[PDB]
Amino acid sequence: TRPANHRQLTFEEIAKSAKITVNKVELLVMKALSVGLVRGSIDEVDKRVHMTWVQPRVLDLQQIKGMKDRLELWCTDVKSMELLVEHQAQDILT
Amino acid sequence: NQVHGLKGLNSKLLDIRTYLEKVASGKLPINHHIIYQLQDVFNLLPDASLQEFVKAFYLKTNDQ
Amino acid sequence: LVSKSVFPEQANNNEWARYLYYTGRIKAIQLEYSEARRTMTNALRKAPQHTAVGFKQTVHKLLIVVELLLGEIPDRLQFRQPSLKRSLMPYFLLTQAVRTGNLAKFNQVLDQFGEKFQTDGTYTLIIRLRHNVIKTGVRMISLSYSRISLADIAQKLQLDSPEDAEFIVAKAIRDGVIEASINHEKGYVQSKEMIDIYSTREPQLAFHQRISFCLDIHNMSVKAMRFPPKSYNKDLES
Amino acid sequence: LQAAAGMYEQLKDEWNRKSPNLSKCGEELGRLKLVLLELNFLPTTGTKLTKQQLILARDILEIGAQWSILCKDIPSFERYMAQLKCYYFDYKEQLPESAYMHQLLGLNLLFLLSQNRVAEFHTELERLPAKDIQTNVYIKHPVSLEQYLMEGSYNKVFLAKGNIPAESYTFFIDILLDTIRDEIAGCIEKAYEKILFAEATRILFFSTPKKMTDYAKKRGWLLGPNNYYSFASQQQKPEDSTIPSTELARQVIEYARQLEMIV
């Protein structure tokens, strides 16, 4: 949902939310990866769990909104970038 | 092919967004597969690194 | 006049060498040793063979001085090899004075040989070289071994004080020559240096400029090459 | 009064080193102009014949120059000073005369330096030599300073003690001094973290901790009564750590496009 630009999450966020101790969250996060809700690696010393991938989920209220936002960012970049690619290398461009 | 590629991506990319709108309002039936696949595209993202070229091409040419 | 001009490449090889020598000479006085060295090194190389020889020796006198001004200590063989070795002998001595960092040899040489230097035209640059004698020594030592006490640099060069050294570092740092900083937390000079540039994007840039620079020349290489045989084929021959 | 050589030079002498005045030696300097138009219609061609006219030319502009320096106005001085120089160069120092030229000459050297017009400074250095024709007392101040300043012995300068001997030089010496103090002041920030107040007065060319507090504050260190060198210093030391990645790569696409086109 929330990050287009990043995909890493801190533990501390879970911890406060749950109101469950820090020691448990590291262990809970490990179960999360094993089920396959998320795939990635956990780096303890940076205090992040980095998601390489997120499981598909059936239509949710938060979800549909994020997808649109990311498609918009994507359209805009592709048009800007198209001008750069076309602008340079004139002699092969035909 | 690379110049065209960017243009191709744009033509395809618009459709994906209108489809998402239709489901939201202007009611259209959801094909579940499509929604499942969409979310996958955004998650793989990393940032860029290196790649560069040497002074060597010039040396040969100067020899001639 | 130098600033305004870039200098195009259609004009013969002898004339280019004259353009570079003159340019190099003037700029260095200001303390623009950096641009001037490039021109002078190109100048020597641009000149002709045996006919050139009289201009070449004057250019060879100026050349050691401009490369010395940068913070480099030129090669000793170079002075030796042209067979103007004798005339080159004070220029080599100036290079040695810069190596040790001692004022006393540098100052006495400048005066004795001053009659010979004035003749070449080099003398104006030679006064600016006094700064370099101490400057080259401190950059050499700091580069090699990063953290050294302020007291240690003072003895080596024969400077007045640990302050006297700190002030050399202060003028330099902004320009970037010595490239170190003074930490008066205990009194040492600490070098900026670190290493592991290949886990950072920064090398792609280094290479990128080198290729861009090469590139404009490559289009030029193909183009120029064909022109002279074609002129000769167009010319009528027996 | 009315002045022009061969019949006047009253005002040069009356201006300073007799009594202070410029209320006759620069207030009446508007009618001197009218003879100047004649005089200046002749060093189009710079020859030895022109000499006679040339010394009269210089004379108003030496008194002109002198009123400007005392008055503490740098721009007026600059217009007056500039004329005298071209009027020396007519076989390169044809006129190196008068001791009411002497002061101007030294002043001109330090003046160029305060602006940090490095090119002009060298141009004058070479043009001028009358530093032993009119002999090293006040003219000595820029000369000492060039040797020291090039060597990088800031301690040796003889510009933070060239305030005390002055003809009316003290003003020029002060603006040039302020330039010297700044150059060092910014650098030191990068140099090291929170260092003593006393250490930060010593090699900051300051006279007291009070002068240092106000001067440091504008620069961006010692905003409070505690050093703040530390912000600046830390940024410089690691050069090999910085990856915003895409931002730093600086458009790989452009370089590639330049490269591909030829083949």
From TrEMBL, chain B:
Leader sequence segment: none
Family: Belongs to the peptidase M67A family.
Protein name: Proteasome 26S subunit, non-ATPase 7
Gene label: Psmd7
Range within the parent protein: 199 to 262 of 326
TrEMBL record, chain C:
Domain PCI: 17-196
Transmembrane annotation, as ranges: none
Similarity comment: family membership: Belongs to the proteasome subunit S3 family.
Assembly with partners or alone: Component of the 19S proteasome regulatory particle complex. The 26S proteasome consists of a 20S core particle (CP) and two 19S regulatory subunits (RP). The regulatory particle is made of a lid composed of 9 subunits including PSMD3, a base containing 6 ATPases and few additional components. Interacts with UBQLN1 (via ubiquitin-like domain). Interacts with ERCC6.
Job of this protein: Component of the 26S proteasome, a multiprotein complex involved in the ATP-dependent degradation of ubiquitinated proteins. This complex plays a key role in the maintenance of protein homeostasis by removing misfolded or damaged proteins, which could impair cellular functions, and by removing proteins whose functions are no longer required. Therefore, the proteasome participates in numerous cellular processes, including cell cycle progression, apoptosis, or DNA damage repair.
Entry protein name: 26S proteasome non-ATPase regulatory subunit 3
Automatic annotation (TrEMBL), chain D:
Listed GO biological process terms: proteasome-mediated ubiquitin-dependent protein catabolic process
Signal peptide range in chain numbering: none
Domain PCI: 75-244
Keywords attached to this entry: Proteasome
Keyword Protein biosynthesis found: no
Keyword Repeat: no
Any one GO CC term of the record: proteasome complex
Subunit architecture: Component of the 19S proteasome regulatory particle complex. The 26S proteasome consists of a 20S core particle (CP) and two 19S regulatory subunits (RP). The regulatory particle is made of a lid composed of 9 subunits including PSMD8, a base containing 6 ATPases and few additional components. Interacts with DDI2. Interacts with TASOR.
Function: Component of the 26S proteasome, a multiprotein complex involved in the ATP-dependent degradation of ubiquitinated proteins. This complex plays a key role in the maintenance of protein homeostasis by removing misfolded or damaged proteins, which could impair cellular functions, and by removing proteins whose functions are no longer required. Therefore, the proteasome participates in numerous cellular processes, including cell cycle progression, apoptosis, or DNA damage repair.
Sequence similarity: Belongs to the proteasome subunit S14 family.
Record protein name field: 26S proteasome non-ATPase regulatory subunit 8
Source species of the chain: Rattus norvegicus (Rat)
Organism phylogeny: Eukaryota, Metazoa, Chordata, Craniata, Vertebrata
